[PDB]
Amino acid sequence: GRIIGYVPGWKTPPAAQELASAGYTHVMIAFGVFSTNTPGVIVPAFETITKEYIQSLHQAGIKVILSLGGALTSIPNTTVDFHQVLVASSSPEAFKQTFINSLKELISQYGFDGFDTDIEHGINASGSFSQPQGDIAVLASIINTMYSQNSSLLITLTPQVANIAATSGFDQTWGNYASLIMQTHQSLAWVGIQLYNTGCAFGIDQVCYGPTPTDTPDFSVAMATDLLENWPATVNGRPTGFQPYISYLRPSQIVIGYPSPNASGGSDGSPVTPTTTIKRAIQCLKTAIAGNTSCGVYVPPRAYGNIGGVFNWEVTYDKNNQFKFAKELKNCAINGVCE
Structure with a gap:
């Protein structure tokens, strides 16, 4: 498995040897944003991330992925809204060709191993959940074309829970990444779930789980389960109204994502889930056996074995906390030894 760290491109990054020693296997450079003038x-x-720094990561054995989108931009004539630049283009085909060429240029120039979809704005639903049109169809085409041309690319999605949790919705918030996953699963290294900055969302049991309380793994486990299982139309004689999500993902394509605390307990993302709970979530997904080192009340419908690993937003917090997030999770996330 994997220990994944987001590296903010507006802060001095930690040294590659510090990250490698802590147990990091992958880093995510935040962010590429979208030109409003050349859609x-x-x-x-x-600006803080150089091709030399990326070379230092590769020399330490760490893979380096370019994260696209994010929450906002301050660069003039840029946006983090995908739809906005897709519709600004002369055609969806021109947009796709420009996006692919631009992404290939950045990958070649900086030596990236792949790219991450952290597109939090402007993935609007069109067509049907099962046969999407517009934004999801175009993004799926970009992902599947890039992977078809280079099957070594690490292509990841980093959804918010509303985007992937069992839902009747299909819009820019609800179920959009679940729809995208059915179109792209064959191309994806992993889907990393943002288990923070969210209200509760539904498990396939029709229970609404949120990140608090952080002393049980239920939320982490239920959200991973939503990606690993078909969404049922009926639960215990009741209609769910769930979209017809069919799971094509392997456990190795599931990553659970959290805010890392600094030494003071500060974070960029709320709430902070402690590493003891994160290990319980992985042990629970592995075994589907409840206990004080494994599942809480929520037990998934089957044992999945080892998932793909863990990410944190973001490594400058973890560095300040002597890399305790990576150090405490690496035996569990990487070697699957969680209790």
Whole structure:
């Protein structure tokens, strides 16, 4: 499995040897944003991150992925809204060609191993959940074309829970990444779930789980389960109204994502889930056996074995906390030894 760290491109990054020693296997450079003047062009917003620094990561054995989108941009004539630049293009085909060429250019120039979809704005639902049109169809085409041309690319999705949790919804918030996953699963290294900055969302049991309380793994386990299982139309004689999500993902394509605390307990993301709970979530997904080192009340419908690992937003917090997030999770996330 994997220990994944987000590296903000507006802060001095930790040394590659510090990250490798802590147990990091992958880092995610935040962020590429979207040109409003050449629709499809990706504008690098990581001034603190050099090709030399990325070489240092590779020399330490860490893979380096370019994260696209994010929450906002301050670069003039840029947006983090995908739809906005897709519709600004002369055609969806021109947009796709420009986006692919621009992404290939950045990958070649910086030596990236792949790219991450952290597109939090402007993945609007069109067509049907099972046969999406518009934004999801175009993004799926970009992902599947990039992977078809280079099956070594690490292509990841980093959804918010509303985007992937069992839902009747299909819009820019609800179920959009679940729809995208059915179109792209064959191309994806992993889907990393943002288990923070969210209200509760539904498990396939029709129970609404949120990140608090953080002393049980239920939320982490239920959200991973929502990606690993078909969404049922009926639960115990009742209609769910759930979209017809069919799971095509392997456990190795599931990553659970959290905010890392600094030494003071501060974080960029709320709430902070302690590493003891994260290990319980992985042990629970592995075994589907409840206990004080494994499942709480929520037990998934089967044992999955080892999932894909863990990420944190973001490594400058973890560094300040002597890399306790990576150090405490690496035996569990990487070697699958969680109790």
